[PDB]
Ligand binder design. Structure first.
Ligand SMILES: [Zn+2]
Lengths: 94, 363, 49, 60, 151
RNA sequence: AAUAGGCGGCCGUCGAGGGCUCGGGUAGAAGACCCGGUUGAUAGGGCGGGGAUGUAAGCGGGAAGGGUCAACCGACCCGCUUAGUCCGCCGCCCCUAAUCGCCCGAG
RNA sequence: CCGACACAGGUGCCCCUGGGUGAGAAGCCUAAGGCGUGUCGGGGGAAACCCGGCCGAGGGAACUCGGCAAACUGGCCCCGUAACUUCGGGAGAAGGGGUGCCUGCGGGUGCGUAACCCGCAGGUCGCAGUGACUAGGGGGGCCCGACUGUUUAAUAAAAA
RNA sequence: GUAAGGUCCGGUGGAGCCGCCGGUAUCGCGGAUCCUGCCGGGAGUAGCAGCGUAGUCGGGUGAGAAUCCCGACCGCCGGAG
RNA sequence: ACCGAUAGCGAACUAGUACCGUGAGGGAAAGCUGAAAAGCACCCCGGGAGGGGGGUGAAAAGAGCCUGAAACCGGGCGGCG
């Protein structure tokens, strides 16, 4: 498990979604896949993707996102509004 | 009008998904010798060999190319004996006895960080298939049940006896849930059959002990699935005229005015593949031990091609090399039985002369 | 609260297309507060626009 | 043609406009006369006994 | 509307609530109310929350044309009427408040009657081919619920 | 199969056996089917194997000629280089996620 | 704006168009300007089948009423072009060869090594040099009408 | 009551109504692809593609945001969009 | 001894009004709270619409207002299943 305040390195395999969507529907699908993968592997209720990460994914157009992505995941606890302690996973490049 | 054979065969209808992924054998051959009539394995892959032909024909005594299929064959576990009496309309099972739980040794346990070895046992892998097994079932209870079955056989109410066997995917590391099968025993006397099953109850059977090299077999398996397929692929109809504005891959007319209904024989779309099929007269070229094939009493070669079989692991146990192709996707459970309707001039029952075996990367 | 007025007036003031106007994302409140051409000019001089 | 496409060519001058006499939009502007009352072409009003609109106006 | 179809309502052991002119599907409202009937109030609220969250399909027994099945037993046609569930959750909370202010215990309330009716139809038109204008109508729904405190 | 079958086993007179949710295709239009689920190699990751193209970027040298026949420019060639890039295939390693939870159920 | 409509039609293509390739107001890429409103979104080896597009071994019209549809050729330079003929044409007939990049020379007009064109020699890379885009397939007989042009707006464009 | 129908009992309603005799009439409903109004199955289905397939990530607003606003990135027309 | 709001003039009412056609010209639908507004003061929930209490009234007749049929739809009840 990932605790609050610790950073981990993840290698998201975006390729797994390449052949299940139309070629022109691959960059946003890769963004969604990154979001879901980070949520699942960090057990986080919400995830914040950095604009730099989004630009890296959208670097080569809407049809050619990177096959693999290397991201840094940092977990934080909100514990605000009384809705339990939601876990926020921040994703950054490298 | 112009005549022609109809598209497809009506002898395999309905073309529906197979009832069970585990194939069923409906008929058995008649053999004098007392042995189990067949075996089970997992389909691994395909390769080719060059062999001196010994089967009758024009190409006799000449080296020939020959495609062969590999079935990994871990030893089977004989864990039940069943008896059949004669009912009003056919055979009906009278009794069935399974052996009590015993420790399992061929389980490939791994020592992970923390905790000791799992220390698995029988009735623990079998639960994944049955889920309801006897409790407090002891050796004395098993012995008395066997005695009761033998007394029934002596009385003569029993007309047949068969063996309940289980596969062991865990030894080859394929999976853990076993497949339970019911096999008839060759011979004539129920007493001989009962003794043969009893002496092996709770023990292991090897394809080397069961089958013979160079004999003809029938292969039973569920074919590869193709999903829903249109009539062009399902039955082989001809494409419509290229000028058609309503499609090309469909039947033109699905019937006349009378009868005022669609006849069941008209080709139509539906499930293709995943059907229970039987292929007759397939020669058993070789049986290999521990994934190794011996050629000339001083040369042995790993049967696994470089890089492993595609979509499959590495052959580590006994295996069967059979001529030609067999139905089923990779890793499918394949049943084999002795030839049920063999020809009259059969090939000799012995391994042929193999001059070359292909082990090059098949991927 | 939709700064179409401010964007168009700034474009007219600066003599350029409306797509070449940059509004500080951290001062949209002040941009909305500015409602007259003079306020828009003040924002342009300050650097918000 | 002859339908929807031709109906798009109605952006020219209107055939009839408001009439200074009867107040209806029936004044032929190109020919300079009214198709409802005859203004600009006849001193007297355009009335016909086969027409009922002038009676409709007064509920007669 | 104002009235209720319930017969033996009394102001001591029962509490009622209603909603009128809801821009939702009366068919799906009926299908949802069928399952909501005869259930505890808190359990019904949890069921509606699950339906909204898309974790539990609502079965269809009357209006189920061209509807695909769902995983699990009893499916069969099913779907997720999120809009209807959200609309009915407000009515459920309103009846809960009514019971609480009347003095009943929310934890012991059981939905003994709940029904949906088709209300007034709001009319409009959509243009079609060949000069045809065709009806385009919104069907509103009335919802009525009365719960009883079990003892 | 309305004569709507046979047998072994487990349960009942809280409770065997299941469903949703979870990681995946030997499957698939929705359903369904199949493997795995800490009793673990299901997928990801790391390493290795086996493949598909065809020798990367960078640097050194040469180059038809030009140029003060100097410096310098130069398509292209050679060496580091069976390289580099990628792998909808395979093996080993529990490093990460297969968790938590909810529901039906004969009497 | 008109067509019942926030209609892919008509009215208005009514007046105007930076850079590169290129003969070009062509095709493609791009600057200014505009837009994400030619307005329902999400999922998926999640099929069969339908509509648009790409390729396809060997044979090459055996299909069909009929080569319908698609394919072949395709730009520029050089050579070389038939029957017939109203001597103007046919004609880009047909058919054949070349085409990139780099290092320099020579010629035209020019004050100019400014700008635009026209040739020559050498080296060199690939399957392919009009490498994308743009971009004719051809020939031989017969009937009708001389030719350009007009016609049943909404099944006939023709020999009428 | 063979009947066209009449009359009684129990609810709603709040203001007119009937028996018998003799006269009068726009005097008796299933159709006329009848007229006017309302409401059904088709159906929670078709359609919301084809001629230009366009959005994504952070922040803001607001009870509520795929659809509103700002920044960045990716795109489309660019002899007209 | 005419009709009684699909009847009677097309119009019982903001009717030759709104609307259709370039034009000549064609031309609808639409009446009723209560005796008196006495037209629901205050309380809880809801973003709102409105819901539940509580008041007015002989009776909600609650303005979506005299009566409230049938078609059609939802629930309960009884029968089959
Ligand atoms: Zn006039």
């Amino acid at each position: 498990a990932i605790k609050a305040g610790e950073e981990v390195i993840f290698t998201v395999p975006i390729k797994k979604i390449k052949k299940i969507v139309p070629r022109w529907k691959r960059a946003p699908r890769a963004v969604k896949f990154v979001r879901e993968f980070v949520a699942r592997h960090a057990k986080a209720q919400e995830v914040i993707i950095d604009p730099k990460v989004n630009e890296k994914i959208w670097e080569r157009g809407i049809e050619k996102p990177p096959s693999k992505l290397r991201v840094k995941v940092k977990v934080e606890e909100e514990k605000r509004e009384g809705e339990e302690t939601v876990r926020i996973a921040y994703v950054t490049l490298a | 009008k112009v005549h022609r054979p109809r598209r497809g065969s009506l002898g395999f209808s309905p073309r529906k998904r197979a009832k069970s992924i585990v194939p069923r054998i409906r008929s058995w051959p008649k053999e004098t010798e007392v042995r189990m009539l067949g075996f089970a394995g997992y389909k691994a892959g395909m390769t080719h060999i060059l062999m001196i032909d010994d089967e009758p024909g024009l190409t006799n005594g000449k080296e020939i190319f020959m495609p062969v299929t590999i079935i990994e064959t871990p030893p089977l576990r004989v864990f039940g004996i069943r008896a059949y009496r004669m009912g009003y309309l056919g055979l009906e099972t009278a009794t069935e006895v399974i052996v009590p739980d015993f420790p399992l040794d061929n389980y490939p346990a791994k020592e992970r960080k923390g905790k000791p070895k799992p220390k698995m046992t029988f009735y623990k892998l079998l639960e994944r298939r049955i889920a309801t097994l006897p409790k407090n079932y002891t050796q004395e209870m098993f012995e008395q049940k066997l005695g009761q079955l033998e007394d029934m056989i002596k009385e003569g109410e029993i007309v047949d006896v068969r063996a309940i066997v289980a596969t062991q995917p865990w030894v080859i590391k394929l999976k853990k849930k076993p497949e339970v099968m019911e096999y008839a025993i060759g011979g004539t006397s129920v007493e001989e059959k009962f003794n043969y099953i009893k002496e092996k109850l709770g023990k292991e059977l090897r394809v080397g002990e069961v089958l013979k090299e160079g004999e003809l077999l029938d292969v039973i398996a569920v074919t590869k699935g193709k999903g829903t397929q249109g009539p062009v692929k399902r039955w082989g109809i001809k494409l419509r005229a290229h000028k058609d504005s309503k499609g090309r891959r469909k039947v033109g007319s699905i019937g006349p005015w009378h009868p005022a209904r669609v006849m069941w024989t008209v080709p139509m779309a539906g499930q293709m593949g995943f059907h229970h099929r039987t292929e007759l007269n397939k020669r058993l070229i070789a049986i290999g031990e521990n994934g190794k094939l011996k050629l000339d009493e001083n040369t042995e070669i790993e049967i696994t091609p470089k890089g492993g079989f595609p979509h499959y692991g590495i052959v580590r146990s006994d295996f069967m090399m059979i001529a030609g192709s067999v139905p089923g996707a990779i890793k499918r459970i394949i049943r084999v039985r002795p030839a049920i309707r063999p020809p009259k001039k059969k090939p000799p029952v012995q391994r042929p002369q193999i001059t070359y075996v292909s082990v090059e990367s098949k991927q | 609260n939709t700064l179409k007025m401010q964007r168009r007036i700034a474009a007219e003031i600066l003599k350029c297309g409306e797509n070449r106007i940059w509004i500080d994302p951290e001062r949209i409140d002040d941009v909305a507060s500015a409602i007259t051409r003079e306020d828009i000019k003040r924002l342009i001089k300050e650097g918000v626009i | 043609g002859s339908g929807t496409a031709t109906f798009g060519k109605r952006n020219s001058t209107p055939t009839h406009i408001r009439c200074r006499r009867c107040g209806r939009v029936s004044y032929n502007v190109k020919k300079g006369y009214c198709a409802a009352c005859g203004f600009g072409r006849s001193r007297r009003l355009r009335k016909y006994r086969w027409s009922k609109k002038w009676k409709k106006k007064k509920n007669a | 509307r104002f009235g209720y179809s319930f017969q033996n309502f009394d102001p001591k052991r029962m509490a009622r609530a209603s909603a009128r002119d809801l821009r939702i599907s009366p068919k799906l409202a009926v299908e949802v109310c069928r399952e909501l009937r005869g259930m505890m109030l808190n359990d019904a609220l949890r069921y509606l929350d699950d339906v909204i969250a898309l974790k539990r399909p609502v079965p269809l027994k009357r209006y189920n044309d061209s509807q695909g099945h769902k995983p699990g037993k009893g499916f069969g046609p099913g779907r997720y009427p999120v809009k209807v569930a959200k609309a009915i959750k407000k009515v459920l909370l309103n009846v809960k408040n009514n019971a609480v202010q009347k003095g009943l215990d929310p934890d012991k309330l059981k939905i003994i009657h709940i029904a949906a009716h088709k209300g007034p139809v709001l009319r409009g038109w959509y243009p079609r081919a060949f000069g045809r204008a065709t009806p385009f109508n919104e069907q509103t729904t009335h919802i009525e619920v009365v719960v009883e405190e079990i003892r």
